[model samples]
Target: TSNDQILEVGAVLLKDFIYERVHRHTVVSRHELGGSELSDPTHKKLAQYLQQIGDELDNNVDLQRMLADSALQPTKEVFVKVAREIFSDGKFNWGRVVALFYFASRLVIEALLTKIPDIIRTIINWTLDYLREHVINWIREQGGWEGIQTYFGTPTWKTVGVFLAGVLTTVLVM
Candidate 1:
């Protein structure tokens, strides 16, 4: 029960942070909803993954910006890297997809280098850390650290070292 709650809450927090900071800029207009020439299926799934947050974020310019810069588009490389590293054979599962979104959002937040308020930054880091810590622990519980070592090399593990590297790298730089 607690595990389920953590999963949902963690997912929501990550989604909301990205909505406020990243995904809002991916669209040109509220009228521009639906398919695009450059859209990836996984990116579409990420949009669907956070539909609730999107709906709540409607018309909030302070929360959601218009797409002004091409460089700020939702980047999927980090998520794919994480998924490829964390799951053997590059398999896709619901949990991995959820983790994919969570870390991808973290990377987006970092990429923007937005000046986040200290309190908001603290909460974001705490929630992200909770998600990363528990998810990795769940993975270990299901298998073992060998599962991690098998899929990810030492340096890569340190790079994708759960939320620590993602959070610290962004926060420390700020």
Candidate 2:
């Protein structure tokens, strides 16, 4: 029953941590620095394209019906492709970049736990590598190594530990 206890404690702690740090936006005074980026013609065009992709995918019935993990693969792949196209000109395509990044992380977790097919694994790995390069550049732009210190610190590791524990419990139970 140790795994069950860990599962309960981990879920409670992880949920509380995420809810406090992330989703509770009103309580947190997060900075929103934007101005000319919003008005620039090219930026406007890119936002339009990003919006189109989100809207199109949001409308897909099959994708909507799929479980979060099941729908994640195609969603992640399409988002990566769209993001690549938008950023091919070597500029940040704003709007849903953060959301896409978070969802992409979900894909990584799912792939890590699942018995993935070789071809699909290759696709995910290549896409992840490509995205990792872009994310590193984005981190540098935001500040430097210090910009993401909190991200690389306890929060990330705690979440990973909880996730791995949950996955292990599921594997053992089955």
Candidate 3:
């Protein structure tokens, strides 16, 4: 059971690390002395705007967690909600998701540099793509329909799956 033992140890370490980092607020220092585009007024404004979008994403997740009475809701639904909330003008645009992820990733990286990654948008895209394919596949493989219902609740799972399929289909078509 070496693999199991390793996984257990990894989970414990991850929990401790995340617990310590997430509970405290870490601020990224902005220096104005350096003569770089990073100090541009427009850049600052864009950064602020993007940061607001990231906060919205966090709010979306909060709302899901708050309102979810059953376990059937797919975790990906939160991301979907955020995408729709930000870009739901009934337009098939993935740039919205990419931008949001960029902002979200950047915001998290500022606090947890090592874990969140510098290429926030890239990471976001990769994660979403992976989820759309393999993660969903794995979930499906592991009792596909049953596992989702068991944890998320039957209705929640259906909703999440349908929404996820729609989003990915759009992504593929686009």
| Segments in model 2 whose C-alpha atoms lie over 4 Å from true places | 1-97, 109-114, 117-128, 145-174
Residue 102 lDDT (model 2): 34
Cα lDDT tens digits for candidate 3, 83-132: 44655564423234334444333333442444533333343343445434
RMSD of each: 17.3, 22.6, 17.8
Clashes of each: 0, 0, 6
Report lDDT per candidate: 0.44, 0.42, 0.39
Better of 1 and 2 by lDDT: 1
The lDDT of model 2 is: 0.42
TM-score of each: 0.26, 0.29, 0.27
Error of 2 at 174 (Å): 70
Ranking by TM-score: 2, 3, 1
